[PDB]
Amino acid sequence: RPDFCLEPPYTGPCKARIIRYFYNAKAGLCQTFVYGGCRAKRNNFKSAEDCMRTCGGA
Amino acid sequence: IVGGTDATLGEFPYQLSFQETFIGFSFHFCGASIYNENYAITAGHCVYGDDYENPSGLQIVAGELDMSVNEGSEQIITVSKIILHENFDYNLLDNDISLLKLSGSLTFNDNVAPIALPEQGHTATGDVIVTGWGTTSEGGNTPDVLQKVTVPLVSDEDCRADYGADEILDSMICAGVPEGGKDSCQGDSGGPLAASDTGSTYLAGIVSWGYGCARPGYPGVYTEVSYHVDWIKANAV
Ligand SMILES: [Ca+2]
Ligand SMILES: [Ca+2]
């Protein structure tokens, strides 16, 4: 999987409450988190499926 | 909203909840303000990346207060078109504003009504009221009941002393107390900052961003509506 999949989730400075997915490498799972609406990092997906397809397997 | 108190029905009739719709439920992700019977005002980053001409699964709710109960005042209308500011800059958060055209007309009453705009170029002063269903602490939970908080406006230069000169644009306005504890937070974006320095209530700001929420020395940053008055009137057609 890409190394960016190993980065912690990043809400950013904006103040929306948008539910996005990130790959949690420690748990080995795609998980939900709150995205604020701007300055997304790469470990930030609109669906669990997008997250699994991108960060799923090594 | 951090450090705020419960609102009451009819207190902020211009407040909207901007929601994503699913089968069996909906999810509030931003606020918005009533401009007229067919148009709402929200932040640009609340809609960035959507299908602007044919948006699906989006609605506004007016006359809302407590999301845990049906109070009979609620009007739920889907969004039919999104007008994102043509010069919206996603990285700088410049021109962070959009309009939502509704697929039907709101009916105005004591609980649902538009908020007046300021005159173009007008500078807001003094205490302002920010409202919404955002989180009540940084990275926390959201309240069922609409929250309100009163905070003093902060000048650009003071706000720039906090964040940096190039990080606060002229068309942004800041608000909060120096000790922190009172702010807008995640889920409040797109919602109203209301001023009253002209003897009447008007929409001075749109909840946009900040360094965390309610932190000492880091007031919330807002899109300054007075810079976009002409834009709103031109596009809300
Ligand atoms: Ca309700
Ligand atoms: Ca300003």
UniProtKB/Swiss-Prot annotation, chain A:
Q: Which cysteines are joined by disulfide bonds?
A: 5-55, 14-38, 30-51
Q: Write out the entry's keywords from A to Z.
A: Disulfide bond, Pharmaceutical, Protease inhibitor, Secreted, Serine protease inhibitor, Signal
Query: Which GO terms of the cellular component aspect does the record hold?
Result: extracellular space; serine protease inhibitor complex
Q: Mostly located where?
A: secreted
Site positions (Reactive bond for trypsin) are 15-16
Taking every annotated instance into account, which residue ranges of this chain make up the domain BPTI/Kunitz inhibitor? 5-55
Q: Which GO terms describe its biological process?
A: negative regulation of platelet aggregation; negative regulation of serine-type endopeptidase activity; negative regulation of thrombin-activated receptor signaling pathway; trypsinogen activation
What compartments host this protein?
Secreted
Question: Which one of the record's GO molecular function terms can you name?
Answer: molecular function inhibitor activity
| Its biological purpose | Inhibits trypsin, kallikrein, chymotrypsin, and plasmin.
This chain belongs to which protein, by name?
Pancreatic trypsin inhibitor
Q: Which organism is it from?
A: Bos taurus (Bovine)
Full-sequence portion shown in this chain: 36 to 93 of 100
